[PDB]
Design a protein around this ligand. Structure first.
Ligand SMILES: *[C@@H]1O[C@H](CO)[C@@H](O[C@@H]2O[C@H](CO)[C@@H](O[C@@H]3O[C@H](CO)[C@@H](O)[C@H](O[C@H]4O[C@H](CO)[C@@H](O)[C@H](O)[C@@H]4O[C@H]4O[C@H](CO)[C@@H](O)[C@H](O)[C@@H]4O)[C@@H]3O)[C@H](O)[C@H]2NC(C)=O)[C@H](O)[C@H]1NC(C)=O
Ligand SMILES: *[C@@H]1O[C@H](CO)[C@@H](O[C@@H]2O[C@H](CO)[C@@H](O[C@@H]3O[C@H](CO[C@H]4O[C@H](CO)[C@@H](O)[C@H](O)[C@@H]4O)[C@@H](O)[C@H](O[C@H]4O[C@H](CO)[C@@H](O)[C@H](O)[C@@H]4O)[C@@H]3O)[C@H](O)[C@H]2NC(C)=O)[C@H](O)[C@H]1NC(C)=O
Ligand SMILES: *[C@@H]1O[C@H](CO)[C@@H](O[C@@H]2O[C@H](CO)[C@@H](O)[C@H](O)[C@H]2NC(C)=O)[C@H](O)[C@H]1NC(C)=O
Ligand SMILES: *[C@@H]1O[C@H](CO)[C@@H](O[C@@H]2O[C@H](CO)[C@@H](O)[C@H](O)[C@H]2NC(C)=O)[C@H](O)[C@H]1NC(C)=O
Ligand code: NAG
Ligand code: NAG
Ligand code: NAG
Ligand code: NAG
Ligand code: NAG
Ligand code: NAG
Ligand code: NAG
Ligand code: NAG
Ligand code: NAG
Ligand code: NAG
Ligand code: NAG
Ligand code: NAG
Ligand code: NAG
Lengths: 118, 431, 430, 132, 126, 438
């Protein structure tokens, strides 16, 4: 219902992204501060998608390949017989590099857009 | 030959700490505090095949509840009348009229010179005090907190009944709960769900005996941070409720004294009828059996054949040697030593009444409780115990004082995490 | 055939929000906000609608009330308190060149006040008005409010003259307005338009008489929540104003008295010249002419054949029974009985008071320090408030008092809604 | 022409959109107002709420695949349980307020359907890229 | 290759790295300061203001049809009055700082043109 | 009909403009508990290759930010402390006459008074010692405190120190802090060695007058700066390239007594001094001083010519807080006589110091703060890093000119520390001409 697929396989969870995607006295200042933070967290994730050319997509396909050093696994090892919580922990080492790679793939295409239209 | 795809809305999370919203069922201090109604029918979603590690001893929301309950209490008193002008030399006598023998000297009938609404006028008044709050100098008395700090008066309209409050997560966060029976306080639980908010928890403050909280459901459950060590307390939930009936039987009146330009002091008035000691009744028919159950569970940790003694408290101040109980705004200090006398292998607890009261043992601010007119009778449930600790025998004694454990004892089954919707995974697609 | 999503739709719903304070750029209302008014406010003719308005349910009035109190409190909150003056007073009568009509109103009182040192007293005396002083048990007197509340002093460096303030909507919101002239107050008017900014309203605090407000354009307008229920008041907006001239009678001075280590009290000092009675002058004809118009507008609701009478007000508090008027922070309490003494088919004496309570929040009193010399107070009567006291006769008497009526009266034609730009309809597109 | 709409025909709602959607982020002596903690906090939180409302619409249009559009088509059929009007009067001759009015009772379900339509479309796109 | 250390590069070269700068606006005891009921609000205001500015710029790109891209293209010709230089003269031998001040009075006018051009483009597509 | 140039637009442009914003502080005492944010443990600096930028220390808002925050902390920390209102009573004072050096005669007054106790109906007769600077004569044994006819006074809390612990200021996202790395920066103009940082280095919030203590030292030569050098009415900020050590002491062995003046309100009264009575003073190497100044004149001559003789003169006018060197160490407040420090011209110096306990901060008239007594004796060693000077000229005499010690406006102290810094905001969007047409 909220995290209904949390214990499931990547395959099973593939159609549930919309489920998570949408869930966003002086004393009361604390609640305001929390609201402000939630907005800020939201926006940084949205920017990252935009700069990767993933604006508007839940499942964005890019031009960056997978390395065997990030994941030494195949289809029945990654999607099946696996769950997102564990898997994400398993590859946490490469989060930063992938993001840098995604930015570069986008930059390389945009330059070819202004020119190639010409 | 798999390529990167970025997935948004992935159902994963990590440990986190944040601000929670308070909510209620819609002049009580917590009624004016939470202006948010709860979900009339709160949601809970079972998470199939999810194992999650909880740790009640490291549960950060506990610190939040403790910090906020203090903030609110204190805020409640901030705009009320200060009693500074009443810190005067007192002239007191032994009013022992129409009393039982144990009350011989419990009250002091004091009189003094004080202000009126005009700066150049004075009045003589008198009132009754409990000896716990009055100290003799070398007939001459002083209030007990005149050599420590300021004393202020609570506003008479504000009540403190512990209306249950629910705590709800902000967007981007989720509350995880163990529905796993016999949860051990720490470690992975394998029966979990995600919830919008916690259930309502009554902000009951006590020492030694935990009142009006959650029950243990299946059996008596003993939890501690470290079982081997004796430097830690032990928090015990009972599965059965134990009923306790408390009273302050004397019919009291109140008087309102004008003290200055626009305000009043609420003084102890007279007493109608005989004076008897305050007390609490615990049925022996339940208490005996209750400790036997506790011991049976202690045998899972300490040999299996040891002799377990219950005993009185260690030395300490009133707040920890007696049971601290509040009802109706009055503060009772009940002698529980006879509640913890037996060794394993009706009960009347006399109670003292204190009026000028430190709260949560944090030194600096003395609050004066206006008297409650009439008589009082309170009935409540003992739902748990605070206990502390030779190959053949061990002894247990009542504990308390650090209120974070009271909060901890209700919140032991909850955890807060943040949601992290962005994941990256391979696919047979390139673009 | 198919569901399509649309956006930019002319849809709105009633809402409660926070409005902005805008001004024209050293006053309660001068240093209280910074938003400039719109130098050229625009109006959107949101026509071809019959928008339902109310005024008895207006969210804007409630925030005006809340915020004016807050502003008032912020002004006084940091100012010196007068607690040291709540002492027994030794008083006598001021009979020096006294007009008999004012006799007994001004008192000469002395007292023992502390000095800057904690161990010394000073003998101080000042003048008081009778309305602020109560006899104990013929020499001993008390300040009237020592048995009720703390009293603070308004700071003499703060002006209290009202300024028109414009309210402005936040983005995502709009204020709907009637351009109608004969609007009931609760009707579905046809003259609908919308704005981001309101007409500025100068806050006016007064009782039994609406001053410095707007006028009706076509006729005298009578409004109430329920005309039938005598519990509701009657408010009248005139289409012509009436001039009223109120003045001080006496060229008074004041004394700056040291009361503590950085604290000063500003006392009423003596009077230059002879003592005279305060009063207000209104044209007798104008008042009679104005009433005639008002009555003709009552008959249409009460019957052409009934008898209409105006009468002196009920008893009650000073702020209820007399006309309470703020002139530079000084308060006049004018006897309006002479304005309501007629049935058919001018000098008002005024009292002066310095210990005053605003918006009936019993508990927080304030002392109004004196203004030096004689001042003139000149204002526009734009309306008033009445109550309803067989079928033979109908009698009306002065009402109001509750400030929400002054604000509501000025905020006659405005409503607040929120904008809802998204929607969905059937179409032909897949 | 901030709200130069009122309603006549829906064709008129197209031309007003840029402004209506722009008005949301309109974009000195305020130093003395910082100390007014109650007055000031109300004005501040109001700004925050305005931001939330803006984002709520953008996020919803985004999940529906309507971002960047003024008019958004999708393969979700119209239901007789929602309305029974022809397709002539309801644009060309009917204003918008009645459209807000009758359709007000049922809406959520539509939003859920719009989300599902996209959910299915994106999965299909991923397969189309993986295949031919 | 650094953060603003492109400022001295020619505009053309500087433009090769935009993401670094693009993300700079969206980032970011600790209890003692909660008692500062005036100061703490100022800090809250500061972060709220930063958010509004970020969003404002994004909305403009939306209006102009340039959203979702760091670099976009439009149908508005250059007006020699804003500046009169050749292409090499601008992309080489030029810092962005200089460029920006040279055309600092021709900004809002372009924005107006961009908005209308995009409005017309939508009208043409409908 | 055209060459067909097309407007384009893009985001991520490295352009900034001057902006005024609020920077935040990063780092038991007043500064530590209010600077909870840690500094970046690994600070960065990015040189802006081939970039020139203009800085102006005289129009710098970072200085104003320091001023406001330094005031705010003083008020925040004194606000909750014991008020000393009840001490404004008639005092009965006599001279302390026991082992007093001649120079200290009349400096210490032994005053008794009737004071409030913890009970409303009880009084106590107490006494303590005061410095004469805090007490005034009534009409001859009758005295009162100097603030009785002006304002309330608050006792500083004994547990809150005001040690000048260095703090850093750091930009919020969207802003950048720029600095000059260049040399001989005039305080104004287009320095070329420019870089930006996330956060500045730490700056010690040292408060002083005349002599600027514990600041940065110049890299190689004395730098003289003023908003207007040729305006004799302006302050001249001089940064030295060699520090001068100064050794200060308060030799009297003090004690304290603590008297209840209410329910939990403890007044810290001066306890008797045990031992002989001596003057507070500072020791400056005589040679170092009559070495270090030679280069000051040499550099003054860069603006005034080296055919003029420059004199350093004493007895600059103003109040105590202006004419003496305002020094605060250990929480003790010293008023050091520097006249012999500025009595020389050309082609170990002991400076006596007075002590005052009733003190005012940043010339905020009508509010005061009582400096509690300190146990024992003190010793402080500090670095003289710069001077605040004014010209005594304007006369028709170019042959000789005199300069005198100046200052008192604390913003100039911070201005010197903030000399090299500026704040701008980032504007990532821009427009330029492009071949592509949508
Ligand atoms: C220029 O820089 C120099 C160098 O930093 C500055 O001079 C230094 O100033 C500090 C503070 O005055 C001084 O530190 C004390 O040195 C004493 C040596 O005997 C210590 O005994 C003393 O310890 C107390 O304070 C500590 C605070 O951290 C406590 O942790 C410690 O337990 C002590 O606390 C007792 O005493 C205090 C009262 O002093 C009392 O409140 C407590 O309750 C408790 O009873 C400090 O460590 C340095 O020694 C000085 N160094 C030099 C070379 O002089 C100089 O001031 C700067 N110049 C300017 C203008 O700012
Ligand atoms: C564990 O949980 C139990 C169950 O809730 C708690 O027991 C309650 O304790 C409260 C506090 O003492 C009781 O509240 C009081 O009840 C009085 C009796 O009410 C009846 O009789 C009067 C007669 O005049 C009738 O008017 C009324 O309708 C009822 O029939 C009230 O008179 C009290 O109100 C007065 O005092 C308060 C003081 O604050 C004033 O504010 C009021 O205005 C008024 O003057 C009050 O409501 C409650 O009745 C108990 N419930 C039950 C079922 O017994 C335990 O206290 C709790 N244990 C712990 C440790 O928290
Ligand atoms: C939790 O684990 C159980 C057990 O593996 C899952 O049950 C399977 O559900 C699918 C549904 O299509 C059936 O085809 C399988 O035969 C079931 N397995 C077994 C052993 O019977 C369940 O779906 C999992 N839940 C989540 C959220 O992942
Ligand atoms: C109604 O408005 C008039 C005009 O502003 C007010 O009378 C003036 O008030 C200002 C306030 O500074 C004085 O400077 C003028 O001299 C006054 N004009 C006179 C007295 O002729 C009047 O007070 C307002 N009335 C009310 C009830 O607020
Ligand atoms: C009030 O003060 C007088 C002083 O003479 C004393 O005799 C009397 O006993 C005091 N009364 C009380 C109640 O303290
Ligand atoms: C269960 O609780 C005991 C303490 O009673 C503790 O030592 C043990 O590690 C806990 N088990 C787990 C899995 O955490
Ligand atoms: C006490 O326990 C009984 C039985 O479990 C329950 O019905 C009652 O509601 C409980 N009362 C309180 C105050 O917890
Ligand atoms: C414990 O029990 C014994 C035997 O009945 C009794 O004498 C003693 O007083 C009891 N102690 C307490 C604390 O009840
Ligand atoms: C001041 O006090 C004295 C002593 O009680 C009294 O005689 C005198 O009349 C008082 N003076 C005033 C002005 O109240
Ligand atoms: C007009 O206002 C009067 C005043 O209460 C009310 O009685 C009457 O019903 C209103 N008429 C309508 C429907 O506008
Ligand atoms: C008010 O005073 C003016 C002169 O300033 C006079 O012309 C006018 O008639 C007076 N109005 C009234 C009602 O007294
Ligand atoms: C005054 O009232 C009477 C009685 O209604 C009327 O005849 C007369 O014309 C009125 N005078 C004026 C000036 O209106
Ligand atoms: C009343 O309003 C008119 C404008 O309609 C103005 O000319 C006149 O001066 C105002 N009179 C008073 C006393 O404010
Ligand atoms: C600075 O200019 C030189 C040419 O003088 C050039 O070689 C160098 O790359 C430039 N540095 C930058 C900012 O890239
Ligand atoms: C106290 O000392 C001063 C010098 O500061 C002296 O003038 C005065 O006469 C002395 N007092 C007495 C009583 O001798
Ligand atoms: C340095 O500042 C002075 C201020 O009087 C000015 O006259 C001089 O031209 C400046 N020098 C440079 C190199 O900018
Ligand atoms: C100051 O200079 C004068 C000469 O004008 C000299 O007599 C005196 O001793 C000098 N004093 C100091 C402290 O240097």
């Amino acid at each position: 219902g909220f995290l209904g697929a949390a214990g499931s396989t990547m395959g099973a969870a593939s159609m549930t992204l919309t489920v998570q995607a949408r869930n966003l006295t002086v004393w009361g200042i604390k609640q305001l501060q929390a609201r402000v933070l939630a907005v800020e967290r939201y926006l940084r994730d949205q920017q990252l998608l935009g700069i990767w050319g993933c604006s508007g997509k839940l499942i964005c396909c890019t031009n960056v390949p997978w390395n065997s050093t990030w994941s030494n696994r195949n289809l029945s090892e990654i999607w099946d017989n696996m769950t997102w919580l564990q898997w994400d922990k398993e590859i946490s080492n490469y989060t930063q590099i992938i993001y840098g790679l995604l930015e570069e793939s986008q930059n390389q295409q945009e330059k070819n857009e202004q020119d190639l239209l010409a | 030959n798999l390529w990167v795809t970025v997935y948004y809305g992935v159902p994963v999370w990590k440990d986190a700490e944040t601000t929670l919203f308070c909510a209620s069922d819609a002049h009580n201090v917590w009624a004016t505090h939470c202006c948010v109604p709860t979900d009339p029918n709160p949601q809970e979603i079972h998470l199939e095949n999810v194992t999650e590690e909880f740790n009640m001893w490291k549960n950060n929301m506990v610190e939040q509840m403790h910090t906020d309950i203090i903030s609110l209490w204190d805020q409640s008193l901030k705009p009320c009348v200060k009693l500074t002008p009443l810190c005067v030399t007192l002239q007191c006598t032994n009013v022992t009229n129409n009393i039982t023998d144990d009350m011989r000297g419990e009250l002091k009938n004091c009189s003094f010179n004080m202000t009126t609404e005009l700066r150049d006028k004075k009045q003589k008044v008198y009132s009754l005090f409990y000896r716990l709050d009055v100290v003799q100098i070398n007939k001459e008395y002083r209030l007990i907190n005149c050599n420590t700090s300021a004393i202020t008066q609570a506003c008479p309209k504000v009540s403190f009944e512990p209306i249950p409050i629910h705590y709800c997560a902000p967007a981007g966060f989720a509350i995880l709960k163990c529905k796993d029976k016999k949860f051990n306080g720490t470690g992975p639980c394998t029966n979990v769900s995600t919830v919008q908010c916690t259930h309502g928890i009554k902000p009951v403050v006590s020492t030694q005996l935990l009142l009006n909280g959650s029950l243990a459901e299946e059996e008596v459950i003993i939890r501690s941070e470290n079982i081997t060590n004796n430097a830690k307390n032990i928090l015990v939930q009972l599965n059965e409720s134990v009923q306790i009936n408390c009273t302050r039987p004397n019919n009291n009146t109140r008087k309102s004294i004008r003290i200055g330009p626009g305000q009043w002091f609420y003084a102890t008035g007279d007493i109608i009828g005989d004076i008897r000691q305050a007390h609490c009744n615990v049925s022996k028919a339940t208490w005996n059996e209750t400790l036997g159950k506790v011991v049976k569970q202690l045998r899972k940790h300490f040999g299996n054949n040891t002799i377990i003694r219950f005993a009185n408290s260690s030395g300490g101040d009133l707040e920890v040697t007696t049971h601290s109980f509040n009802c109706g705004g009055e503060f009772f200090y009940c002698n529980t030593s006879g509640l913890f006398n037996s060794t394993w292998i009706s009960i009347t607890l006399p109670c003292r009444i204190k009026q000028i009261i430190n709260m949560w043992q944090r030194i600096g601010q003395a609050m004066y409780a206006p008297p409650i007119q009439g008589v009082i009778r309170c009935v409540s449930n003992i739902t748990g115990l605070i206990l502390t600790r030779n190959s053949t025998t061990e002894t247990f004694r009542p504990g308390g004082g650090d209120m974070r454990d009271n909060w901890r004892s209700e919140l032991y089954k909850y955890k807060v995490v943040k949601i992290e919707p962005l994941g990256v995974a391979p696919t047979r697609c390139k673009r």
